[PDB]
Design goal:
binds 4-(2-aminoethyl)benzenesulfonyl fluoride; 11 helices; homodimer; ATP synthesis; 437 residues; hydrolase; binds chloride ion; five-stranded mixed β-sheet; alpha/beta
Amino acid sequence: AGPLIFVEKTEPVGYNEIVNIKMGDGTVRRGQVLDSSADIVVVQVFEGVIFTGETLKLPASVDLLGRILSGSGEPRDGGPRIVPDQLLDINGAAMNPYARLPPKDFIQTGISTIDGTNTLVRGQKLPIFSASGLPHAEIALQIARQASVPGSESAFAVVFAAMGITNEEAQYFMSDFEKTGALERAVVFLNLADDPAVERIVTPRMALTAAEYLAYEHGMHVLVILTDITNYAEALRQMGAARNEVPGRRGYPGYMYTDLATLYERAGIVKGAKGSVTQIPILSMPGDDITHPIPDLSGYITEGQIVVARELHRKGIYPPINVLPSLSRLMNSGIGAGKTREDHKAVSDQMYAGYAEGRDLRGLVAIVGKEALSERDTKFLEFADLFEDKFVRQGRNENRTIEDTLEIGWQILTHLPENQLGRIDNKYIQKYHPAHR
Amino acid sequence: IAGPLIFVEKTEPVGYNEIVNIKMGDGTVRRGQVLDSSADIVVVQVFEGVIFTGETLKLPASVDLLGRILSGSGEPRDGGPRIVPDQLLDINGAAMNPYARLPPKDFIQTGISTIDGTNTLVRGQKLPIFSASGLPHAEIALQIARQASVPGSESAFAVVFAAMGITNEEAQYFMSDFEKTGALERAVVFLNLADDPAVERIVTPRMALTAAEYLAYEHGMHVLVILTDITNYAEALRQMGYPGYMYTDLATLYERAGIVKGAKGSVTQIPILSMPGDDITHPIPDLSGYITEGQIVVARELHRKGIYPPINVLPSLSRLMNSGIGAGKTREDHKAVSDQMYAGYAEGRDLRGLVAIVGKEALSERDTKFLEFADLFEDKFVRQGRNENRTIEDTLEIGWQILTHLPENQLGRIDNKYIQKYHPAHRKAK
Ligand SMILES: NCCc1ccc(S(=O)(=O)F)cc1
Ligand SMILES: [Cl-]
């Protein structure tokens, strides 16, 4: 009748078995079993002799940082089990950590097509929208390695959670975190394709609980990277009461309509305002809607999105992010004097407009021929190439500061006639344009 | 297959890979190579007396295109006579540049609240409908074709409706709907059937856009072009993953929008971008080139819940909305009401998550109001009849009514001046 909770399995259980559960806060719930792995039971609680169990707990400690764990929080790094400061329920009920404050202030990802044009702010949920065969995992990993909060008095941490991945992918992520030293400031949760589906379902909840704990109890800005929500959804649609039931039809369980919202609700500035939880969920377009209907991923898209584009990938460009369909709705809260730089908005606006114009002119060029294009139009056409070649394109290991990003922006903007810079205040042209300054 | 596609009248027999000249609207010629052909239309890939010099494929242009149903090649499909042209216009877009260097602006009333209210369509904009297999994007497209208008515009309004690769049953349905509602009288309708030559499918949006340019520029009209659907267009390129040149080819479609020279007309596009239900047989194309001014998102969640039209405003966006709203265009309170409904709906939807974490009875009284607001938004604002044509006033007033469910002190996005003037609890009866 109510919330799904996650319980430590201590004996075999049957479908719809009535159970009593001891919660993290010491209270008890009664509920019904939906599904189970070897170690975990999924229980749907009721409001207000049988099996008595305890909830599955995150072993919460600052010593989570530097560790690589399974989806259930068990070590994968050869290290000892986490010694907990606190044992926390994982479904979101623990801590009540979120403030009623808007997201704000800069997270530097080091990727120009995010920081420059679609800025990530602390407390935001900003999905990466992608598809099979595109390098969204590479982008996610690069952000994990590079992200920081310039000028903040609060410490920064990363929670990286990968779901449904292959053995070789897991080995790769582990090696990357270890060799780069990104592991020092990260908690890494790795769920394998062949791990139990219930473990996959618990994975983002373990990750979000760790993030909330570090943000709220330790005053950290925490960035949570979740790759891939689509993979999570493929497990969900075959778990418990959803098994062989069809979305929108009789028999499809109500919790399937709100499950994704239990994940996307969990982001924001935390109480005290010294910390925050920011999410970058990867949403890969599944390709199999007809055979594998999943919960609508649109619910996760309320504060913008970063779009990975096959066009740019096929051009040989990494990261292949198309800024034009990309958006950060909270960008203005994270940029400008004292955050990035005063000319940030102006430079972003002008690059966006110039790139959009240049891309339209690729069409016009095809319609009339290169020789028929005006000199002014040719400059914008060329600007779109410069934008893709110099601004969009950056190394896998290239961590650009926002100043680096804005400088590249100004350099490519010099290709346009100064009189065509309609989105940039004259004050910023005089102060920052390379032909001046 | 590298160069851009140009369409040429079949006036003489041609062969594959034959090198040809194409005569352009200004008397110059471009050189190309024959890629493919139907009986009447040659597809040339362009580069950079002795050889074939071809004429561009032409639209027979006249105001009498209005009220007609044509094929993708412009031939009558309505039993009527062939169009008698005032002009023969190159459909490749090259003989005439009607577009002004002006930003899109001013209101197009679709009559659909989740467009007009929260992500307003403006004249000259390209605003795709982003949808997927099994969703009612075609119903939405037809509803917009029936309902759209430009309130208070001195310029007359027309619709160009182009459907690509459709079944005979869909064709009959579209024709019937245009005819019986009278929507046909202000429209030029281009219907390309699935079994029509693939060449005619790729010519279809170019015929449509040429018709819209002619009406907009030569007759001072605001023209709304509805193109359904681009995924099917992309598949025709495939049967002629996707070819590399597709991205440039799409730009030849999406460049063709905006206010026209003189600013008494415009070409606005609503392309339908539908994601295939089966990746294996119908690969997912990168149509993101078309998405530069926002998107209207058709959502499975809302469709599953039995709501029409199933538009989720939160991922939807109109980048140019501010240029189409307010005093003299819609109403002064538009931006505030939109901002507040968006914020309230987003908060309510997050609170659906919280309910599924802590249980409904654990929510605060305040949070419960926002939770209930999300239900009201979906049931009263999102939901509307297939033939329910809402004025912007109607949609703003629905908005105000549902906003009364929230505590007045929680209306952070609304200027006190608009609360005093328009909030049902304060507004004076006049
Ligand atoms: N197989 C279709 C290709 C084609 C079809 C027709 C011609 S033509 O007769 O009009 F010259 C040329 C090439
Ligand atoms: Cl859903």
